[PDB]
Amino acid sequence: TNPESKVFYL
Amino acid sequence: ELHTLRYIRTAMTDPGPGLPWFVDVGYVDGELFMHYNSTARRAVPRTEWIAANTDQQYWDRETQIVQGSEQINRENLDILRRRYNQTGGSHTVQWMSGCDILEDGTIRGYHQAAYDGRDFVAFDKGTMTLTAAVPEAVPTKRKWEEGGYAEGLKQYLEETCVEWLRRYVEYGKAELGRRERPEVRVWGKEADGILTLSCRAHGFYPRPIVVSWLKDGAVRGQDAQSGGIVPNGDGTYHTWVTIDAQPGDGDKYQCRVEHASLPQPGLYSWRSGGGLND
Amino acid sequence: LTPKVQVYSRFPASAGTKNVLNCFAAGFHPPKISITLMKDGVPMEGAQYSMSFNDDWTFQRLVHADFTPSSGSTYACKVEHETLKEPQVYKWDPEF
């Protein structure tokens, strides 16, 4: 499964 | 027993014409299975083994989480442009995520990002903190320390991503384990006193292959030039290996093909000729 | 980074037989690339594309189209990039 949207914040 | 999982994201400012700005592709042992684009806005299956083992509820959840990251990567292109003091042009935000289950049993999880090709941030497992490569990646670590996103990423890379990968291998046990024999063709071309002998392998699975040229039954690794393993539209692979020789010596040269589908290394000649010599 | 492009067919070349003409470009940045398959200097009909990248952040793209090899007809692949200045065209040979 793809990672959660929260772990892509920069 | 080496199994790999990879989810690669790309955020683009210039796609350009008739192309998606956000692209998310999923892989199981190199094979494509998951696809997402900013135009379609939906997570769709590519190979038959995933669709046969997953319901719509799975793909509905897979759509929204990537749709959420699409909006996050949209604003990330603007935040990172202000840090470097850029008005606009061609800027790219790349992302690498997934797990690697080693043959022994060790779990290796990766989570990293890159801005304009060069490295930006990377997650460390043995420290549970986000590592900043560039001086512009310092405010990113401050954001990660504020929200505490590392805790949710730790349980994913160690359990969630691992548990699903074990299932993906079992679901595509017949497709990934299947071997495909390649159609070999040996050619030659004369230019200016030199004969360029070519060897091409058409459609083979898996990706690893050893294609080397021989002279009088002896390997010539230095003189032979390879174009690398290139993929086909159907999922199969192709390879191109060339060698330079004197005119009237072409028949003395042999093409050696080492593949999982073949029990012994296949030896092919120009006048034989190629793969149809059985 | 300049793209490393090569033109190749899916199945071995045969006269009056259907085949797929592939053109794979790898090791390039920015991701904006113009890959077009040609027949006698004229773009080929029904061209389909694949965006992906390697572990070393270098981009890759495959452009493929269904075709029939004809005698006296030349097949090529035109690649346009900002690092190239002049477009590099790779010629496809049926017996090479």
Tell me which residue of C26, C32, C72 sits closest to B238, measured CA to CA.
C26
Domain extent at residue C33: 1-96
The tally of domains found in chain B comes to 2
Burial of C24 (C-beta count, 10 Å sphere; 0-12/13-18/19+): buried
| Strand ranges (E), chain B | 3-12, 22-28, 31-37, 44-45, 92-101, 107-115, 118-123, 130-132, 183-190, 195-204, 210-215, 224-231, 237-245, 253-258, 266-268
The reply to whether C42 touches chain B by the CB within 8 Å rule is no
DSSP letters of chain C? ---EEEEEESS---TT--EEEEEEEEEESSS--EEEEEETTEEPSS-EE--EE-TTS-EEEEEEEEE---TT--EEEEEE-TTTSS-EEEEE-TT-
Q: Is C22 at the interface with chain B, CB within 8 A? A: yes
d(CA B129, CA C32): 33
Among B7, B72, B113, the residue with its CB nearest the CB of A5 is: B72
- Please indicate if any CB of chain A lies within 8 Å of the CB of B52: no
Same domain, B124 and B29: yes
CA R_g for chain B = 24
- Is residue B100 located within the same domain as residue B200? no
B107 and B8 housed in the same domain: yes
Does B65 touch chain A if contact means CB atoms closer than 8 Å?
yes
Q: B36 near B23, Cβ under 8 Å?
A: yes
Q: Are residues B157 and B202 in the same domain?
A: no
User: What is the least distance, in Å, from the CA of B58 to any CA of chain A?
Assistant: 9
Resolution in A: 2.9
Q: Which two tokens stand for residue B154?
A: 């730790």
The answer to whether B26 faces chain A, any CB pair under 8 Å, is yes
Is residue B277 included in any domain, yes or no? no
Claim to verify: residue B173 and residue B183 sit in the same structural domain = no
CATH number of domain containing B40:
3.30.500.10
Residue B274 lies in a domain: no
Number of independent structural domains in chain C:
1
Asked if B92 lies within 8 A of C29 by C-beta distance, the reply is: yes
> To which H or E segment does residue B140 belong?
helix B138-147
Contact between B276 and B192 (Cβ < 8 Å):
no
Token output for B66: 């990537």
Q: Give the side-chain half-sphere CA count within 13 A for C51.
A: 28
Residues sharing a CB contact under 8 Å with residue B61, sequence separation 6 or more, in sequence order: none
Task: Look at A9 and B72 and tell me if their CB atoms are within 8 Å.
Answer: yes
Residue type, B47: T
Residue whose C-alpha is closest to residue B93's, from B68, B108, B110, B75: B75
Of B141, B156, B178, the residue that ends a domain is B178
| Shared-domain flag, residues B156 and B103 | yes
Residue B275 is assigned to a structural domain of this protein: no
Q: Is residue C29 within 8 angstroms of chain B, CB to CB? A: yes
- B168 and B184 fall within a common domain: no
- Identify how the structure was determined: X-ray
B105 and B120 co-located in one domain: yes
Phi/psi at B79 (5° precision) = -65, -45
The reply to whether B57 falls in a domain is: yes
Task: Give residue B217's domain range.
Answer: 179-268
Contact between residue C32 and residue B20 where contact means Cβ atoms under 8 Å apart = no
CB contact under 8 A, B62 and A1: yes
Nearest CB to A5; choose among B68, B147, B156: B68
Name the residue type at position B76.
Answer: N
Q: Is B188 helix (H, G, I), strand (E, B) or coil?
A: strand
In CATH, what number is assigned to the domain containing residue B199?
2.60.40.10
Q: Are B22 and B10 in contact (CB under 8 A)?
A: yes
Shared-domain flag, residues B219 and B235: yes
User: Is B33 found in the same domain as B146?
Assistant: yes
Name the domain boundary from B144, B178, B212.
B178
| Alpha-carbon distances, residue B244 vs B86, B213, B272 (angstroms) | 49, 10, 20
Whether B278 maps to a domain, the answer reads: no
Does residue B273 belong to any structural domain of this protein? Answer: no
Residues B125 and B16 in one domain: yes
Of C6, C12, C50, the CB nearest to B185: C12
Residue in C10, C26, C30 closest to B14 by CB:
C30
Cβ atoms B258, B210 nearer than 8 A: yes
Tell me which chain C residues have a C-beta less than 8 angstroms from the C-beta of B15.
Answer: 31-32
B84 touches chain A (CB under 8 A): no
HEC profile of B48-110: HHHHHHCCHHHHHHHHHHHHHHHHHHHHHHHHHHHHCCCCCCCCEEEEEEEEEECCCCCEEEE
Same domain flag for B111 and B213:
no
C5: domain CATH number? 2.60.40.10
- The position carrying tokens 């999880």 is B109
